[PDB]
Symmetry: D2
């Protein structure tokens, strides 16, 4: 009996097979879920990646900065799952911040137009996606977003950390709205995972020193985590997401669950 058996779930944010969304989708399908996928910009590329999943799923284009994509979303999803059918789950695994606002560029040197784009994509779109999809969600349903613990300032992450603080606040308000549908809203705050932008930094995209900086960060996470942290394994966080998509966290909403090996509960 699959954890997510017979549930219909939207998963956004797949760009590579290292994407956390790829692993969320993989585990969900392994647990019997039937998926609808959305992708940004490179849909042909994305489709080839989604071919590696254990099961087939419709792939829809969704640019969360495009108002016309959002307006048509529920209609396009309903055609994909069949009329008379609704979503039980929604996964928001979308996040972006330009190099000016995340990396090595000084905090003061991020122009607002770049930050505002990061906040649009990483924080506001969580409400946009909930607004668009709630009218086609079943009661008892679950919306999950991806978080990165912003309670303390940290080097490099800069304005993406600020965007995550905003996202945390947005999640609380989305929960108010989603409650009217009998739907939960939560974030999973993950530890660092080697996704595309992180692999690039390690590769020297932002210079030699920065690629060393991230590796030390990842190693200090593992020390701090009482049960350790593997930055090349997205599966543990994908399971936490599926747990929130299940009926086993039925009284948790507007909340943040930490899938970081316990590192945030430890000072050293």
């Amino acid at each position: 009996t699959g954890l997510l058996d017979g549930k219909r779930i939207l998963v956004s944010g797949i760009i590579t097979d290292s994407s956390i969304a790829f692993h969320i989708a993989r585990v969900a399908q392994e647990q019997g879920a039937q998926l609808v996928l959305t992708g940004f910009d490179r849909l042909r590329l994305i489709q080839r990646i989604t071919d590696r999943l254990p099961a087939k799923a419709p792939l829809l284009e969704l640019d969360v900065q495009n108002e016309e994509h959002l307006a048509s979303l529920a209609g396009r999803v309903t055609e994909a799952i069949g009329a008379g059918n609704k979503l039980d789950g929604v996964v928001h695994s979308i996040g972006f911040m330009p190099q000016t606002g995340m990396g090595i560029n000084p905090f003061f040197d991020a122009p607002y137009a770049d930050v505002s784009k990061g906040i649009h994509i990483s924080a506001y779109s969580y409400a946009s996606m909930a607004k668009a999809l709630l009218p086609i969600m079943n009661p008892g349903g679950s919306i999950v977003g991806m978080d990165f613990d912003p309670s303390r300032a940290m080097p490099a992450y800069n304005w993406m950390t600020v965007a995550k603080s905003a996202l945390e606040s947005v999640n609380r308000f989305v929960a108010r709205e989603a409650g009217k549908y009998g739907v939960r809203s939560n974030l999973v705050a993950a530890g660092p995972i080697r996704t595309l932008a992180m692999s690039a930094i390690v590769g020297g995209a932002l210079g030699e020193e920065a690629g060393a900086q991230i590796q030390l960060l990842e190693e200090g996470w593992d020390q701090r985590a009482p049960i350790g942290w593997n930055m090349k394994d997205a599966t543990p966080v994908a399971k936490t997401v599926c747990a929130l998509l299940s009926d086993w966290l039925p009284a948790t909403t507007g909340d943040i669950i930490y899938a970081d090996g316990g590192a945030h509960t430890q000072l050293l």
Copy 2:
């Protein structure tokens, strides 16, 4: 299948068929878990109650204020579960505070001897049980304790709230000890179950999905979730089963 299929879990704190521990144990068994139970004094009464559970399970005597009970516990658990087998889960559903430190009695009029007993039973005992039971726990295992959000003061709960603050701190350190065993330690912060009436009713109002103080199932499932393999990267943490009330001001 079952969420907890083939798992062996210690559950403490069953006293009535209304106890949260009772429902955690009931749901655990419904989800394929194989249980060991603990009781404090009236084991015959408790046995008659644990008989109302869906399945039979060994009941061991445990006074957490008794050092000899703690010393023999792992051994008594192992003999009860059969040699060569270990626990996958431990549920700490024990909490106590004399009326002097909780209720209508003023905060300042609680003598320390009463506060100390409450903290012994409600907070220190979480470390006691973890110490005793970790050597016989499987990797991937989970220890869960029950919490009530003490981040803000509230009328009546008083020194028990102080006791929960201590327990949250205790839980972080047990997480430190348990990690080498590959074991998670977390608390589930539940909403009120079963001036104070106004406090408790504010929960349903605050909760985006509402809160039913007479339904223990939602928090019982959440405990079973932490007992499962589905929260594998969470430890030293607090999971809120309160309808989302603690995330809303009004």
Copy 3:
């Protein structure tokens, strides 16, 4: 002596004599501080208001969305306080959110252009002002911003709460930058105060319900606060800001001080 004696302090955000910035400036001047004020848009109106202060102070135009104003700010401040002199204090009491994102308008019905404007003015501008003024701040100096506790979601405040969550995160990053200058950065999280927009809402500008929600919020604050809370008295919040501007909190930075009567530490 006077608490802020001989200190040169920038104070932004005065629009009426009910503005928190008005009271911050009054208390600062009462404590021997020598002020430079900044105002937005309606400077002749503002000047008439700032004349009611106990002492004279230069008034400069500053629109935090205007890049030319920010680029010229330090120079205009220096010209006002005299070359060879620097600021010891900066008070950021600027905050705005369009009706679409704050009040009675549903959470989902706020267009991003309005949200982005609110976040620009209320959160991003905190970094902008620090960037502009840090090069003319003395070691031992202090920057203070105004906060409204966003840790939990609340009715009406909506997207302004999101903007404050971002602001809290911004403050942590600004403290890092200000540290190189030997300057502290902190926020004061005030309880509700009857300023211009609040008087409008309470007065029925957005209907009877919106004003009642706010009064209900204000009354629950007053009950929750162990020492009470008066929404018409800004002086306690002004004293707290002046305390942070002084040398008496010398080891506090990147932090939040709550001037809310203690309401946030109590559950009813």
Copy 4:
């Protein structure tokens, strides 16, 4: 003028001239406050309190001694004169046996040792508030000493558990103190380990106790008039930063 000018303040926890309570007392006196001191070996402490800029009565107070607490208010009043009240109370007492703090493992702390530590470090904040609030002026302030327990850390162990308890205790004392118009707050100081200076945007000097002593004096002043049940951080901002 003076920050605490004309204010009367109880200061507890002085044992050496390196103890934080000592520096709190000095700055308070430098700012015009008139002090009452308490001690737990009273003869040695008196030798320490002589090094302050000014004299202050020293009274015996064992917070585990119920009789001392019962007589505490009476003894303070005779030292400051009838008709006069305390404007401030400083709780700078904290203790934990080696079994519950240091190199001894977390699981090996017997409860009798932990319970003693929690008594002195957490419960006694309420005890002292209970005993002294009836002789406190409105606008008054109770300040206790904290060390941020929100995250587990090596060595500190059960004293951290004790500090978590103190933080919860402080909130309830604030409810009680509100009836008197008195504020209750904690100062979470940095250590007075080396990574602290690194995390703090303004740095941290573990050999300089004055910045935190000044922070205590601020809460004792009328300049934080709307803060209660709260924690003020004097750690150079280190708790707000990751790495």
